[PDB]
Design a protein around this ligand. Sequence first.
Ligand SMILES: [Zn+2]
Length: 64
Amino acid sequence: HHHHHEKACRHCHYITSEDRCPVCGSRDLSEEWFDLVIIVDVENSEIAKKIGAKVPGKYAIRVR
Ligand SMILES: [Zn+2]
């Protein structure tokens, strides 16, 4: 796993193994992040609503 301990975007918190965030495009990926959540269908996800995510995938609640 639920934590770092895949990098998390410092701007939108999406978790990726790519060299840039697919959601917002940022290169600001952190190795230090906590509390993984998974969103499969944004429109039908309570955790998406809670965190404001608009693209499905894995997100960290906390990113340093
Ligand atoms: Zn991002």
